[PDB]
Design an enzyme around this catalytic site. Structure first.
Site, PDB file in Angstrom:
ATOM      1  N   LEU A   1      74.360  -0.808 -76.651  1.00 55.49           N
ATOM      2  CA  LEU A   1      74.488   0.055 -77.834  1.00 55.49           C
ATOM      3  C   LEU A   1      73.862  -0.471 -79.104  1.00 55.49           C
ATOM      4  CD1 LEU A   1      78.157   1.278 -77.463  1.00 55.49           C
ATOM      5  CD2 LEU A   1      76.068   2.178 -76.366  1.00 55.49           C
ATOM      6  N   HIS A   2      73.212   0.427 -79.823  1.00 53.00           N
ATOM      7  CA  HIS A   2      72.600   0.086 -81.099  1.00 53.00           C
ATOM      8  C   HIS A   2      72.872   1.231 -82.085  1.00 53.00           C
ATOM      9  CE1 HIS A   2      69.619   3.039 -80.108  1.00 53.00           C
ATOM     10  NE2 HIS A   2      69.209   2.358 -79.052  1.00 53.00           N
TER      11      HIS A   2
ATOM     12  N   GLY B   1      70.707  12.146 -78.024  1.00 53.42           N
ATOM     13  CA  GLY B   1      69.784  11.900 -79.108  1.00 53.42           C
ATOM     14  C   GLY B   1      68.470  12.639 -78.943  1.00 53.42           C
TER      15      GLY B   1
ATOM     16  N   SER C   1      65.659   1.812 -80.142  1.00 52.20           N
ATOM     17  CA  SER C   1      65.665   1.899 -78.692  1.00 52.20           C
ATOM     18  C   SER C   1      66.074   0.542 -78.155  1.00 52.20           C
ATOM     19  CB  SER C   1      64.240   2.211 -78.214  1.00 52.20           C
ATOM     20  OG  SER C   1      64.164   2.217 -76.806  1.00 52.20           O
ATOM     21  N   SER C   2      66.793   0.514 -77.049  1.00 50.47           N
ATOM     22  CA  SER C   2      67.164  -0.798 -76.530  1.00 50.47           C
ATOM     23  C   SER C   2      65.909  -1.520 -76.040  1.00 50.47           C
ATOM     24  CB  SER C   2      68.174  -0.663 -75.395  1.00 50.47           C
ATOM     25  OG  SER C   2      67.668   0.192 -74.398  1.00 50.47           O
ATOM     26  N   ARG C   3      64.843  -0.782 -75.744  1.00 49.28           N
ATOM     27  CA  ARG C   3      63.631  -1.458 -75.278  1.00 49.28           C
ATOM     28  C   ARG C   3      62.838  -2.154 -76.401  1.00 49.28           C
ATOM     29  NH1 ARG C   3      60.835   3.943 -73.099  1.00 49.28           N
ATOM     30  NH2 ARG C   3      63.061   4.506 -72.975  1.00 49.28           N
TER      31      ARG C   3
ATOM     32  N   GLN D   1      68.656   7.165 -61.738  1.00 45.52           N
ATOM     33  CA  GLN D   1      67.555   7.539 -62.603  1.00 45.52           C
ATOM     34  C   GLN D   1      66.501   6.456 -62.751  1.00 45.52           C
ATOM     35  OE1 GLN D   1      70.458   8.204 -65.881  1.00 45.52           O
ATOM     36  NE2 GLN D   1      68.811   7.388 -67.212  1.00 45.52           N
TER      37      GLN D   1
ATOM     38  N   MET E   1      74.030   4.376 -71.486  1.00 43.14           N
ATOM     39  CA  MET E   1      73.828   3.371 -70.446  1.00 43.14           C
ATOM     40  C   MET E   1      74.084   1.992 -71.065  1.00 43.14           C
ATOM     41  SD  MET E   1      71.191   4.708 -67.699  1.00 43.14           S
ATOM     42  CE  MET E   1      69.663   4.188 -68.385  1.00 43.14           C
ATOM     43  N   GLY E   2      74.930   1.962 -72.088  1.00 40.83           N
ATOM     44  CA  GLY E   2      75.251   0.692 -72.736  1.00 40.83           C
ATOM     45  C   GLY E   2      74.125   0.132 -73.590  1.00 40.83           C
TER      46      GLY E   2
ATOM     47  N   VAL F   1      67.540   7.982 -84.971  1.00 44.10           N
ATOM     48  CA  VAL F   1      67.817   6.932 -85.953  1.00 44.10           C
ATOM     49  C   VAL F   1      66.623   5.987 -85.924  1.00 44.10           C
ATOM     50  CG1 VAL F   1      69.381   5.150 -86.766  1.00 44.10           C
ATOM     51  CG2 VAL F   1      70.293   7.096 -85.498  1.00 44.10           C
TER      52      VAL F   1
ATOM     53  N   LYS G   1      65.734  11.492 -79.747  1.00 48.38           N
ATOM     54  CA  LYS G   1      64.694  10.540 -79.358  1.00 48.38           C
ATOM     55  C   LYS G   1      64.185  10.822 -77.941  1.00 48.38           C
ATOM     56  CE  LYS G   1      65.253   6.586 -77.622  1.00 48.38           C
ATOM     57  NZ  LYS G   1      65.699   5.195 -77.368  1.00 48.38           N
ATOM     58  N   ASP G   2      65.099  11.076 -77.013  1.00 53.31           N
ATOM     59  CA  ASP G   2      64.688  11.402 -75.649  1.00 53.31           C
ATOM     60  C   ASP G   2      64.735  12.927 -75.608  1.00 53.31           C
ATOM     61  OD1 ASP G   2      64.583   8.678 -74.179  1.00 53.31           O
ATOM     62  OD2 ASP G   2      66.405   8.623 -75.386  1.00 53.31           O
TER      63      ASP G   2
ATOM     64  N   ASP H   1      79.336  -6.780 -76.585  1.00 52.51           N
ATOM     65  CA  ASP H   1      78.955  -6.261 -77.886  1.00 52.51           C
ATOM     66  C   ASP H   1      79.194  -4.748 -77.886  1.00 52.51           C
ATOM     67  OD1 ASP H   1      78.009  -8.765 -78.772  1.00 52.51           O
ATOM     68  OD2 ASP H   1      76.051  -8.398 -77.855  1.00 52.51           O
ATOM     69  N   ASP H   2      78.945  -4.084 -76.758  1.00 51.26           N
ATOM     70  CA  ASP H   2      79.146  -2.628 -76.716  1.00 51.26           C
ATOM     71  C   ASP H   2      80.584  -2.251 -77.072  1.00 51.26           C
ATOM     72  OD1 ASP H   2      76.535  -2.503 -75.787  1.00 51.26           O
ATOM     73  OD2 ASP H   2      77.113  -1.979 -73.703  1.00 51.26           O
TER      74      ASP H   2
ATOM     75  N   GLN I   1      64.628  14.800 -72.230  1.00 55.11           N
ATOM     76  CA  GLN I   1      65.929  14.698 -71.583  1.00 55.11           C
ATOM     77  C   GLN I   1      66.909  15.709 -72.203  1.00 55.11           C
ATOM     78  OE1 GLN I   1      68.221  11.026 -70.418  1.00 55.11           O
ATOM     79  NE2 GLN I   1      68.958  11.250 -72.541  1.00 55.11           N
TER      80      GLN I   1
ATOM     81  N   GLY J   1      71.366   3.774 -83.035  1.00 55.54           N
ATOM     82  CA  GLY J   1      71.088   5.123 -82.582  1.00 55.54           C
ATOM     83  C   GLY J   1      72.316   5.666 -81.850  1.00 55.54           C
ATOM     84  N   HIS J   2      72.915   4.855 -80.988  1.00 59.05           N
ATOM     85  CA  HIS J   2      74.104   5.332 -80.279  1.00 59.05           C
ATOM     86  C   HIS J   2      75.248   5.570 -81.242  1.00 59.05           C
ATOM     87  CE1 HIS J   2      71.982   2.868 -77.200  1.00 59.05           C
ATOM     88  NE2 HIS J   2      72.174   3.978 -76.509  1.00 59.05           N
TER      89      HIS J   2
ATOM     90  N   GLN K   1      81.461  -2.792 -80.691  1.00 58.51           N
ATOM     91  CA  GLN K   1      80.929  -1.752 -81.552  1.00 58.51           C
ATOM     92  C   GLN K   1      81.778  -0.492 -81.466  1.00 58.51           C
ATOM     93  OE1 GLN K   1      76.935  -1.649 -82.835  1.00 58.51           O
ATOM     94  NE2 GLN K   1      76.190  -2.499 -80.893  1.00 58.51           N
TER      95      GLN K   1
HETATM   96  N1  LIG Z   1      67.152   5.877 -82.074  1.00 52.36           N
HETATM   97  C1  LIG Z   1      67.995   6.744 -81.534  1.00 52.36           C
HETATM   98  N2  LIG Z   1      68.518   7.772 -82.322  1.00 52.36           N
HETATM   99  C2  LIG Z   1      69.385   8.695 -81.808  1.00 52.36           C
HETATM  100  N3  LIG Z   1      69.826   8.729 -80.513  1.00 52.36           N
HETATM  101  C3  LIG Z   1      69.284   7.683 -79.751  1.00 52.36           C
HETATM  102  C4  LIG Z   1      68.391   6.681 -80.179  1.00 52.36           C
HETATM  103  N4  LIG Z   1      68.078   5.809 -79.130  1.00 52.36           N
HETATM  104  C5  LIG Z   1      68.777   6.325 -78.151  1.00 52.36           C
HETATM  105  N5  LIG Z   1      69.520   7.444 -78.432  1.00 52.36           N
HETATM  106  C6  LIG Z   1      70.385   8.246 -77.572  1.00 52.36           C
HETATM  107  O1  LIG Z   1      71.453   7.480 -77.021  1.00 52.36           O
HETATM  108  C7  LIG Z   1      71.744   7.992 -75.682  1.00 52.36           C
HETATM  109  C8  LIG Z   1      71.764   6.877 -74.630  1.00 52.36           C
HETATM  110  O2  LIG Z   1      70.435   6.349 -74.357  1.00 52.36           O
HETATM  111  P1  LIG Z   1      70.166   4.823 -73.843  1.00 52.36           P
HETATM  112  O3  LIG Z   1      69.082   4.866 -72.820  1.00 52.36           O
HETATM  113  O4  LIG Z   1      71.554   4.372 -73.409  1.00 52.36           O
HETATM  114  C9  LIG Z   1      69.700   3.901 -75.027  1.00 52.36           C
HETATM  115  P2  LIG Z   1      68.183   3.657 -75.313  1.00 52.36           P
HETATM  116  O5  LIG Z   1      68.054   3.007 -76.697  1.00 52.36           O
HETATM  117  O6  LIG Z   1      67.429   4.981 -75.334  1.00 52.36           O
HETATM  118  O7  LIG Z   1      67.570   2.637 -74.202  1.00 52.36           O
HETATM  119  P3  LIG Z   1      66.087   2.388 -73.573  1.00 52.36           P
HETATM  120  O8  LIG Z   1      65.102   1.908 -74.684  1.00 52.36           O
HETATM  121  O9  LIG Z   1      66.204   1.257 -72.488  1.00 52.36           O
HETATM  122  O10 LIG Z   1      65.597   3.722 -72.950  1.00 52.36           O
HETATM  123  C10 LIG Z   1      70.689   9.054 -75.406  1.00 52.36           C
HETATM  124  O11 LIG Z   1      71.258  10.362 -75.635  1.00 52.36           O
HETATM  125  C11 LIG Z   1      69.603   8.719 -76.370  1.00 52.36           C
HETATM  126  O12 LIG Z   1      68.677   9.783 -76.641  1.00 52.36           O
HETATM  127  C1  LIG Z   2      71.931  10.641 -70.440  1.00 51.08           C
HETATM  128  C2  LIG Z   2      72.156   9.289 -69.778  1.00 51.08           C
HETATM  129  C3  LIG Z   2      73.367   8.565 -70.407  1.00 51.08           C
HETATM  130  C4  LIG Z   2      72.388   9.489 -68.281  1.00 51.08           C
HETATM  131  O1  LIG Z   2      72.577   8.229 -67.643  1.00 51.08           O
HETATM  132  C5  LIG Z   2      70.870   8.382 -69.866  1.00 51.08           C
HETATM  133  O2  LIG Z   2      69.748   9.068 -69.280  1.00 51.08           O
HETATM  134  C6  LIG Z   2      70.494   7.999 -71.332  1.00 51.08           C
HETATM  135  O3  LIG Z   2      70.604   6.811 -71.696  1.00 51.08           O
HETATM  136  O4  LIG Z   2      70.087   8.945 -72.119  1.00 51.08           O
END
Ligand SMILES: Nc1ncnc2c1ncn2[C@@H]1O[C@H](COP(=O)(O)CP(=O)(O)OP(=O)(O)O)[C@@H](O)[C@H]1O
Ligand SMILES: CC(C)(CO)[C@@H](O)C(=O)[O-]
Ligand SMILES: Nc1ncnc2c1ncn2[C@@H]1O[C@H](COP(=O)(O)CP(=O)(O)OP(=O)(O)O)[C@@H](O)[C@H]1O
Ligand SMILES: [Mg+2]
Lengths: 281, 288
Positions: free
Chosen positions: B41-42, B156, B194-196, B70, B38-39, B185, B158-159, B86-87, B162, B44-45, B90
């Site tokens: 990017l850090h 990842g 996490s982007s949050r 979602q 969902m963009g 990561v 992390k979720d 930036d995305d 999911q 982890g992505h 990267q």
């Molecule tokens: N620290 C991390 N290590 C490995 N994978 C990660 C990660 N943080 C996110 N991902 C993975 O990157 C993918 C995209 O998730 P995103 O929601 O786009 C980023 P996010 O950092 O998880 O944002 P958020 O904090 O707003 O929820 C997912 O498959 C997620 O599990």
């Molecule tokens: C899997 C995904 C890209 C679906 O929008 C989203 O839930 C996320 O950031 O993991």
């Protein structure tokens, strides 16, 4: 290793992975995979689907035979005879999975249809189409056909499958095949065997009502609907559940233009359905 | 087929464009890898991207789409971080050849019509207070998989819930794709990226180390059993200032209708101010 596939013969596979592998291998060899989903107990209506699939150049026809428990709220099972008919038609692949092979984890992830699934046939059977779309999506993913064939007789089902394909970005062409009818117009259906003589004669009213409406349509939508209702009103023991004129995607019917007229009625304990193209004006 | 410049970042917004290019590439023997994001990017992505990149002869497609389905009503969708420039920078630095950036209208031309109904796991943990969240996730992932038709798709750990739900989606609908989970990561002190994390002020950032500290303490305490593991995690979380635990649960690895038996996953969700953080770790019970 890819399972054995004998060209020109009817190859039967029960494991999803087997038909998936063969289908993939065949597509790589220069064939176009055609899928005809059925629940067995084949009749001329199903054969029309098969013939439509076979005429596509390079076709390899896959006929699935699977009584899907999810689309039910006793079902006729004639394996040997169904396979003989397929062999007679020159079909090369029959996919006959067990319920356990299709639902190894029970009902978990499923498809939720849009609102059209709650209308018309969805009134008496509100979970029916979720069952249909779920099994059709699975069959599409297992077989990965270039085209999938369904009869126009179940028009709402056909429309919902077109919605499934569009909404989930599926790469398959959905082909609707015209309803095969008995000599007097009755839509062929396995359930017709349950009609006694009086009900079977009264049943002609559904198709007669629809074709009368299609020709009355030059006089407008109301004329078409009233003509169909008059024909149904001339039949004894025909409990009409609905008689609706809609656009071709089953939304509200346009002021003029193309549409579809659908009817469903109960004769004794047998529910019959039918539908027809309508051009208003 | 739109233009595809090999060795460069090709950006496509139209689903048909990426579908045609992916198909063409697959037909020449290249294996297509999909990294849904969902963009914003850090690192982890980037780990997901690198995991994809290393598959021999692969071409990597990273989708960037902030999926409205979602998000539950509120300003959650509007508040989601967006850093498109930036995305793409990267992705270029990572040698990614395809970025798929669809519009909401291209993905939902008919609004919410046919959708995916997840199994019961979707109503638990993260889904408890957000009953429609995972249907949104699975519906969009199903669509992305149909559009791109990758050989493997990367998510990842992390979720974790999911990831499990996506494995259910793939198994339940007979999807011909391999789901690859990639380890979480973390920052130098253990914080899951996490982007949050950008919403944690300096103090909350300091306190947030408690989630990962609690999980790793639990993983090592687990030689003494489940109660010891959970109590060790609770003690660390309880000693953390300003950390409000939403849930801390030890479950079988599939998070399903099965009791914990030897191998599990410990999951935590906690709030620091208005920021809700998640983390999870593999747990082995009675193993040193
Ligand atoms: N620290 C991390 N290590 C490995 N994978 C990660 C990660 N943080 C996110 N991902 C993975 O990157 C993918 C995209 O998730 P995103 O929601 O786009 C980023 P996010 O950092 O998880 O944002 P958020 O904090 O707003 O929820 C997912 O498959 C997620 O599990
Ligand atoms: C899997 C995904 C890209 C679906 O929008 C989203 O839930 C996320 O950031 O993991
Ligand atoms: N008369 C007919 N003409 C064309 N296609 C038909 C048809 N009757 C059935 N089909 C198609 O055959 C496929 C299998 O549907 P089934 O329900 O299994 C057979 P059926 O004859 O409709 O039995 P039923 O009376 O128990 O409902 C569907 O695509 C259906 O629309
Ligand atoms: Mg039928």
């Amino acid at each position: 290793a890819i399972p054995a596939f004998h060209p020109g013969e009817l190859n039967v596979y029960s494991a999803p992975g087997d038909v998936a592998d063969v289908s993939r291998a065949l597509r790589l060899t220069g064939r176009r995979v055609m899928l005809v989903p059925t629940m067995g107990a084949l009749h001329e209506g199903h054969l029309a689907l098969v013939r439509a699939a076979k005429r596509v150049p390079g076709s390899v026809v896959v006929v699935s035979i699977f009584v899907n428990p999810m689309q039910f709220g006793a079902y006729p099972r004639t394996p040997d005879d169904d396979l003989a008919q397929l062999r007679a038609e020159g079909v090369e692949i029959a996919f006959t999975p067990t319920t356990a092979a299709m639902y190894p984890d029970g009902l978990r992830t499923t498809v939720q249809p849009g609102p059209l699934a709650a209308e018309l046939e969805g009134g008496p059977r509100p979970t029916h189409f979720a069952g249909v779309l779920t099994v059709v999506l699975k069959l599409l993913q297992i077989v990965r056909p270039d085209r999938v064939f369904f009869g126009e007789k179940d028009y709402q089902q056909l429309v919902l499958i077109r919605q499934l394909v569009a909404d989930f970005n599926l790469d398959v062409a959905v082909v609707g095949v015209p309803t095969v009818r008995e000599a007097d117009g009755l839509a062929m259906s396995s359930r017709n065997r349950y009609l006694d003589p009086a009900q079977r004669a009264a049943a002609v009213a559904l198709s007669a009502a629809l074709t009368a409406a299609a020709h009355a349509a030059t006089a407008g939508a109301q004329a078409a609907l009233d003509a169909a209702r008059a024909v149904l009103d001339a039949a004894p023991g025909v409990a009409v559940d609905y008689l609706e004129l809609r656009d071709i995607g089953l939304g509200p019917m346009p002021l003029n233009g193309s549409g579809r007229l659908l009817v469903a009625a109960r004769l004794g304990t047998t529910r019959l359905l039918d539908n027809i193209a309508i051009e208003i004006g």
